[PDB]
Amino acid sequence: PEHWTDMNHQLFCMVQLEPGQSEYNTIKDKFTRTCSSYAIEKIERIQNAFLWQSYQVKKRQMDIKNDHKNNERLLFHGTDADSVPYVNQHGFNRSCNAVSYGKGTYFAVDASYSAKDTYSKPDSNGRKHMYVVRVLTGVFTKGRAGLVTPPPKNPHNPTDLFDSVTNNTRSPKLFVVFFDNQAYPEYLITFTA
Amino acid sequence: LPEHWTDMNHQLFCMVQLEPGQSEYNTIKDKFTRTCSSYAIEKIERIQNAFLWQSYQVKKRQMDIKNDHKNNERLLFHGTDADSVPYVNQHGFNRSCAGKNAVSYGKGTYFAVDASYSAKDTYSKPDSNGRKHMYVVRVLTGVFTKGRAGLVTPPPKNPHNPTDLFDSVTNNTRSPKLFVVFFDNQAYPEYLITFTA
């Protein structure tokens, strides 16, 4: 509830951003950093009170666990149009492509990666969909195929887990998280090639 | 955090051994022995997990707002293997780890009305010392329907509104004996029963 606009006591609303204003410009710049050849049709702010409450609880918990670190990253997730309503209302669900770094939900550092047709599948009118996502990446390690949770931070204590996994710890391009409410879909970009 | 919990002194997790003669022990033992009178309880431990409890209580408040005057919470049983007890105590019930049930009503975490069901060796596997383990679990069953093997999420209430979902599924709406839940923090492991033949 920062840039959020009044919901008239609704628990969910999608708010189309005004082009040229501060917020729209901030999100468009994140995308055009690597996707400047695309065409943005609109950016929508996702105001989902329940998803936000659940996410903020996990953030407070991870801030306490990781004795004061920035546990949050702003990442991208391409989806097909038929998945957009579900994610808007319910967020990202690992139980719903290639799971090379584990059976989790995947998020890209670069819009360009999420802009692949394999992730942001064009609909019948050629429109592609990509979320801008607050992700609790926390303390992370290299993933591997078949993980169902992150590995332990010390194998001597096998329930004290990493927060997420990546392809490459030193220069990450993707992150996988394995729990509900570790990812908040903040904006939806509708765009074309 | 509930006022009856042991003071945990800045720590986020503790198991508390209950005393026979306490109402708290006696009620869990009666709920268990109702259908498992042939088994014998070694101990009942109260699970105090601050973070699990916070996430669960947030999901309960949301369901109590969404559903309007529904009894959304049931106290149910879950049999566990000894090797899984440390993970459940710390992190709760993860659908991605769940076994395939003999009668599947969906891919999620299963919870039994009757301790007898959870007491089967298939769920509460005897450890190397012949100890079996069963959780007593606060489950947000909410509004439910008969499930089906294909489900990875609860089904929609209405096929023309795919995102407005049942809270859980059962084997039988008229006479429910099991409940399946498909999301994290919909189940709080409240008590661990250690028992033997």
Ligand SMILES: COc1ccc2c(=O)[nH]c3sccc3c2c1
């Ligand atoms: C392998 O790394 C990625 C990186 C980014 C993405 C993404 O944006 N959307 C989707 S949808 C299923 C897989 C992915 C994915 C996977």
